[PDB]
Amino acid sequence: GSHMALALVGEKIDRNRFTGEKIENSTFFNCDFSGADLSGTEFIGCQFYDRESQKGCNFSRAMLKDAIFKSCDLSMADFRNSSALGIEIRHCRAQGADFRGASFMFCSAYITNTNLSYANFSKVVLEKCELWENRWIGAQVLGATFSGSDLSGGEFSTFDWEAANFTHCDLTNSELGDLDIRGVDLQGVKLDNYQASLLMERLGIAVI
């Protein structure tokens, strides 16, 4: 089934209300999707963040297997302890979204072209996932692992490279902020020539 221009406020969403459904140009303000089965559910052009109340929606413990969020505002969304294997978040605003305890598992996740500023990834396991072209300013990554993921095209100013595992990641074509090859384990990491020159410059070396 498909839904267009819904506008829900303050609702508890029943576990099976939207499973496998397609929802477009809809608003969900202060809604509780916790425990909901959103397997295969596809949200396009939807807003889950309420400018007035400044509340997001609750997705904690939701089943999000193969769910899709395209061009949605998921600012301040609570995804804690969700089951998110194969989730897609594409071209979304996800500022302050909370992923702690979410499972993406072997891992699979596609979070791309997404504003992840101030999002919380503490202790999250996102190994060998698709995580490119995101904005990561102030993202909380304490104890996380992104090992092997493609993070390329990313904006990593105000980002603690020492806080998470980045080994084997693709970091090419990214603003690296304060990354330094003397202080961070970069085994297996991919970087581009422009980034290599910058990083070497930090050591006082001029790459000609």
Next chain:
Amino acid sequence: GSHMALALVGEKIDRNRFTGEKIENSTFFNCDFSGADLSGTEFIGCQFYDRESQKGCNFSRAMLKDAIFKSCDLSMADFRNSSALGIEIRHCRAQGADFRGASFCSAYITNTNLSYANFSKVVLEKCELWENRWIGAQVLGATFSGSDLSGGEFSTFDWEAANFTHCDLTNSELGDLDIRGVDLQGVKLDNYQASLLMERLGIAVIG
């Protein structure tokens, strides 16, 4: 004056015998030039090494200001404590040559085989030292700071032993240089070299 196709063996060279002269295509086997005045002396195509005795020539404490050696075999030459400001050594073999105590900064040593040469404690700052082979050269306590070493071959070379800050190292085989253990402030490296040094840290440079 100039001189061509001389052959000397086992001679002690008079202090003023060759001062300011040009000497070409000559042989000097086991000859002692120590303390000789060789200011402005030019040697071209000369052999100073005798493979039959495996002995070089002695230039210790020689005055070598503005001297030139081009296309010469200076293997095993003893240059210790010489005065060599502005010396030119170009396209020479200088394997095992000893430069300990030699004073230069201005010097041009280029396109030269310096394998197993001794540069211990030598000061060669801001000099032209490019396209040389440095395999096994001894450099403990030397400083090459600011010199152009580009086009060089540096396998079996102790990068930790001397001062290489501000050097041009571009287009060189770097041997075991590692950015973790060596001060490389001001050093110039090319993109290929940067990629190799990163590779040592496990980092793959792609595009």
